[PDB]
Amino acid sequence: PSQVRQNYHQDAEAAINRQINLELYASYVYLSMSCYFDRDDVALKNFAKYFLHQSHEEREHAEKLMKLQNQRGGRIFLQDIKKPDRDDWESGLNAMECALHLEKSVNQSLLELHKLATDKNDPHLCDFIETYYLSEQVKSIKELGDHVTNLRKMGAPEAGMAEYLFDKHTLG
Amino acid sequence: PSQVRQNYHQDAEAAINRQINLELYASYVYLSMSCYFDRDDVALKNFAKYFLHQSHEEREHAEKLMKLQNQRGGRIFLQDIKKPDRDDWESGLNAMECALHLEKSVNQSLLELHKLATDKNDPHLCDFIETYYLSEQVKSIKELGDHVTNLRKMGAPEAGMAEYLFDKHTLG
Amino acid sequence: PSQVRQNYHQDAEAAINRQINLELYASYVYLSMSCYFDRDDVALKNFAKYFLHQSHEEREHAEKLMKLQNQRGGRIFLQDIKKPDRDDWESGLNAMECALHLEKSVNQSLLELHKLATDKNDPHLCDFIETYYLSEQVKSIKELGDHVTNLRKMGAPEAGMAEYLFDKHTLG
Amino acid sequence: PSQVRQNYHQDAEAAINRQINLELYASYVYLSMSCYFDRDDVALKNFAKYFLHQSHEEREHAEKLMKLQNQRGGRIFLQDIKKPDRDDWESGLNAMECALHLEKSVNQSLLELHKLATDKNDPHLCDFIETYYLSEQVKSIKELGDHVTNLRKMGAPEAGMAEYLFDKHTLG
Ligand SMILES: [Fe+3]
């Protein structure tokens, strides 16, 4: 094997590659949302900025996983990055709800990866996931839930002023 | 002819003079809008500021065309600057819609001018129009479309708060 | 159509979407190269840094195309980002050769897109491609050719010192 | 027992003392390497500097373990620090290979210590080992593997220029 490989199960390496592809897919979905809100018939600049920042953060998460895989002596295997489920995200509120669902799915995959690391007795991988991924997932889920709650209370998307003022005040 | 004239067709010179008059007319229309929003019974300061800035930008575009005409050895012929079609612009949303229409008409005239430059094999004129006028027209049209979309979603002009809050948050 | 759409053919919109997917694919390929050179059994840090920078530049090119598509009133349609052709790039020289091939293919697609813009009489699109994409492609192709020539003269990859010293002196 | 002792098994205390002695031994071995490369007939200053820094880092690791042992109410028991296996390390490449082996052995002992902490339900000890020792071991192993790979590709130690240029460019 690799000269640096030590206590790194092949199942963990495969699951790291799968998580890499999932993070890249999440980056792609956020890019799709960000480009939806830049349309002339949507025109919510701070929503688009927020989702572009989320896309870049997901890219950084994938790159950190790739660095971890090379650090442990595993070999990175890249797969296709699937296109997002839709191109029209229909509202700021619907995009925030879908982002919340996506982040919860990514968190569930990370929890499965941590369970795999625990079952294989890989404390370094468990420490990596706990330190760099689980807490960030919890904060992201809480922030998206806060956003969805506020937009819902404002009357979005029926109340046309709601998404505009949320764009100005919360995301601006 | 002029001692500096070279590869400058008379049709291009005439079309440059026509474009000069069109830019001056657009400046006049924007000045009319800006003075409409400064009325005591309208009182939207940031709308008036936005349209005054647009008027000054259109005048700068006309001056740049005049400089181009003198640079190529053509002779500037000024015509009457027609008064705008109306004095009462009736709302912020209606003024933005009419501005979008005016910018699209100016862009169509610029595209015709570029086609004329291409048919006459004047690469300097084509480069001038592409570099300094077409891209700015595209950005201006996109910005006006964004403004119209946002005002429409806010419920303007029926929702009285819409134009006020758009004046404060987007134009302010 | 879009309220901002003007002189934007549907063929141009489709070709812009295809170019978007091509730029994203090129970013993915460069990311694959960058992760190959971070392996413990390759260990060329400046090669990996160079290819990571190339990946980020390709993503920026894709984002600029997306902004152009929204600016002209076209609608962005995202497709799958295909996985790179290989995971093992076998040497610094082979990776540079494949990068040169990839950049030439991207340039050929850009030239086809410019020919389409010229045939449809879209001077704004032609100006966009010429200003922001063709010159950068020419610089990138020249730089990659220089790199390949230097590595070949050094005796890479048979001469083991060649890629190391190229990593230190040229890429470092 | 100690007035501060709480949830600290005697097996954990014994294993902490053993790890202390192992870290001190690793510091001694690195000091031996550093003094080997300062010889007039070897004369690789940056190799010696690198190994002296490694020796000081291992001593700091031992001191941190000693502080942990006093913090939990355990009692430090020091043993003999055995002399290194050899005095002549024969090359930069051989010294790097032996350093890689030594760091992997230290990492294996740390993994055993973490398994002991997990079996005894000592979350503070597991957190201490994961935060301060396992990640650093992974970085050190990866760095040493990178060094060995680069020296091997350069042709060390047969190619006399290889260790000199690695000393100047990588370690300098
Ligand atoms: Fe040198």
- D131: which chain A residues are within 8 Å (Cβ-Cβ)? 127
Asked if A3's CB is within 8 angstroms of D148's CB, the reply is: yes
Q: Which two tokens stand for residue A91?
A: 């509202």
- Strand, coil or helix: what is C81? strand
Q: CA of B142, closest CA in chain C: separation in Å?
A: 6
Nearest to C157 by CA among C73, C103, C88: C88
Q: Which residues pair with C81 in a beta bridge?
A: A81
Distance from C-alpha of B41 to C-alpha of B34, rounded to nearest angstrom: 14
- The residues on D that touch A, with CB distances below 8 Å, are 100, 104, 107-108, 111, 114-115, 118, 126, 129-131, 134-135, 138-139, 141-142, 144-145, 148-149
Rounded to whole angstroms, the Cα distance separating C58 from C56 reads 5
The torsion angles phi and psi of B88, rounded to 5 degrees, stand at: -100, 115
Instruction: In whole angstroms, give the CA distance from residue D34 to residue D44.
Output: 9
Give me the helices (H) in B120-159, please. 123-129, 135-154
Report the amino acid identity of residue B101: H
With contact defined as beta carbons under 8 Å apart, do D59 and D24 qualify?
Answer: yes
From residue D92, alpha-carbon distances to A26, B94, B161, D47 in Å are: 45, 78, 76, 7
Spell out which residues of chain B touch residue A43, defining contact as CB-CB under 8 Å: 145-147, 149-150
Residue B162 CB: number of other CB atoms within 10 A?
Answer: 23
The torsion angle over the Cα atoms of residues B25, B26, B30 and B36, rounded to 10 degrees, is 50
- Nearest-angstrom CA–CA distance, C21 and A119: 40
- ∠ CA C28-C29-C30, nearest 5°, is 90
Of A59, A76, A87, the CB nearest to C87: A76
Q: Which residues of D touch A4 (CB under 8 A)?
A: 100, 141-142, 144-145
What does the alpha-carbon distance between residue D72 and residue D6 come to, in Å, rounded to a whole number?
A: 7
Q: What does the DSSP 8-state code read for residue B121?
A: T
Distance from CA of C123 to the nearest CA of D (A): 51
Tell me the DSSP string of D104-158.
HHHHHHHHHHHHHHHHTT-HHHHHHHIIIIIHHHHHHHHHHHHHHHHHHHHTTTT
CA distance A69 to chain C (A): 9
From residue C95, alpha-carbon distances to C22, C45, C89, D38 in Å are 18, 14, 6, 39
The answer to whether the CB of D25 falls within 8 A of the CB of D82 is yes
Query: Which residues in A have their CB inside 8 Å of a CB on D?
Result: 2-4, 6-7, 70-73, 121, 123-124, 126-128
How many Å lie between the centroid of ligand 1 and the Cα of residue D165? 6
What is the per-residue burial (b if ≥16 Cβ within 10 Å, else e) of A87-104? eebebbbbbbbbbbebbe
Residue type, B148: V
Binding residues of C for Fe cation: 23, 58, 61, 103, 137
Domains of chain A: 10-170 (1.20.1260.10)
Chains B and C touch (3+ CB pairs under 8 A): yes
Which residue from A32, A63, A73 is facing C78, i.e. has the nearest CB?
A: A32
d(CA A147, CA B151): 23
d(CA A135, CA A129): 9
Q: How far apart are CA B48 and CA B32, in angstroms?
A: 9
Nearest to C43 among D150, D161, D169 (CB): D150
Q: Do chains B and D touch (3 or more CB pairs under 8 A)?
A: no
Which chain A residues touch B150 with a CB distance below 8 Å?
43, 164
Name the residue in chain C with its Cα closest to that of A72.
C40
User: In chain D, count of helices (H) and strands (E)?
Assistant: 6, 0
Annotated binding site: which residue ranges of D? 23, 58, 61, 103, 137
Contacts of C168 in chain D (CB under 8 A): 169
| C chain contacts of residue A21, beta-carbon cutoff 8 Å | none
Query: What angle do the packed helices B135-154 and C45-71 form, to 10 degrees?
Result: 70
- Of B164, B160, B145, the residue nearest B37 (C-alpha): B164
CA atoms of C42 and C29, how far apart (whole Å): 18
How far is the C-alpha of A46 from the C-alpha of A51, rounded, in Å?
A: 9
Nearest to C35 among A4, A31, A70 (CB): A70
- Neighboring chain A residues of B153 at a CB cutoff of 8 Å: 160, 163-164
**Which residues share a beta bridge with A81?**
C81
Q: Show me where chain D is broken: residue before each gap, C-N > 2.5 A.
A: none
Contact C80, A80 (CB under 8 A): yes
Q: How was this structure determined?
A: cryo-EM
Give me A76's structure tokens.
């990175």
Q: In angstroms, what is the span from residue C165 Cα to ligand 1's centroid? A: 6
- With a CB cutoff of 8 Å and minimum separation 6, the contacts of D101 are none
Measured distance CA(B148)–CA(A39) in Å, rounded: 12
Measured torsion, CA atoms of residues B17, B21, B23, B26, in degrees rounded to the nearest 10: -160
- Chain A residues with CB-CB distance to C39 below 8 A: 70, 75
The answer to whether the CB of A54 falls within 8 A of the CB of A35 is no
Q: How far is CA A129 from the centre of its chain?
A: 14
Give chain D's radius of gyration (CA, Å).
18
Q: Do A40 and B145 touch (CB under 8 A)?
A: yes
- 8 Å CB contact of A7 and D111: yes
Cα dist from A92 to A142, A151, A171, C75, whole Å: 17, 8, 11, 18
Query: Resolution of the coordinates in A?
Result: 2.2
Q: Which chains touch D (3 or more CB pairs under 8 A)?
A: A, C
Q: Which of B72, B76, B84, B82 is nearest to B31 (CA)?
A: B84
Interface-testing mutation among C35, C38, C41, C47, with chain D (most D C-beta atoms within 10 A): C41
What string of DSSP letters covers A59-92? Answer: HHHHHHHHHHHHHTT-------BPPPS-S---SH
CB neighbour list of residue C107: distance below 8 Å, 6 or more residues apart? C134, C137, C138, C141
Q: Residue A139 belongs to what H/E stretch? A: helix A135-154
Angstrom distance (rounded) from CA D127 to CA C159: 46
In degrees and rounded to multiples of 5, residue C81 shows phi and psi of -95, 110
